[PDB]
């Protein structure tokens with residue numbers, strides 16, 4: 001309940017778990033990510049210490065004790081929590097989705113510029129702050145790359161948001177930026193339909209679906225044709241032809 005200057009409170013999110021924490025001698029609330037030691041965590045920290053943008057969470061301090069089994073990362077609190085939960089019977093309106101998607105674009109553009117591939121973009125990792133804007137959270141599985149892009153081979157992140165080129169049975173190499181774009185696409189889809197476009201309780205089937213099922217649109221809710229086009233481009237199963245962030249930024253539906 002007490003970590004030096006911090007007073008741990010209830011859980012607000014959940015690898016590991018996040019709790020509301022009160023900072024005495026500062027008299028302010030913070031978000032405390034608590035992890036039980038049971039080098040990735042130090043890569044997350046390294047990545048975070050390098051990020052400063054209004055649409056990305058902000059690491060404030062790390063409490064590591066070789067003696068203690070627990071490790072704590074304190075972040076500035078993004079008070080309103082997840083923009084939405086999936087699934088949900090109450091999707092967002094187009095205008096709401098565009099608003100948030102714009103923040104997501106700004107944040108992703110920044111992360112890619114800083115040579116960071118998030119690898120876990122989804123509605124639940126987009127927290128709404130005091131001013132109503134989104135902040136990308138949970139870099140627990142992100143990668144840092146040198147060069148123009150990342151050349152990856154590992155399969156990490158949330159199943160329903162994984163890109164098809166990362167689900168080969170042969171462990172092939174694939175581009176990193178395109179992975180985030182694909183996840184942004186599944187995310188925009190969730191924004192207005194209230195559920196993922198590819199589902200299956202059997203992992204290997206989901207993989208097959210993500211890789212082979214053609215994108216389908218529920219006739220209800222009804223969405224503008226330009227939005228269906230944007231989503232279709234972001235969910236292009238071929239990485240080489242999938243729309244890139246610079247283009248998304250200038251798409252009719254986004255600038256509309």
Ligand SMILES: O=C(O)c1ccc2c3c1cccc3c(=O)n1c3ccccc3nc21
Pocket residue numbers: 012013014018031033057058075076077078079080081082127137138139
């Ligand atoms: O970066 C992270 O891993 C992370 C994960 C979750 C949260 C957070 C994370 C990182 C920084 C901040 C938060 C955060 O403020 N919250 C929440 C606030 C209200 C309701 C739920 C919340 N969940 C988080």
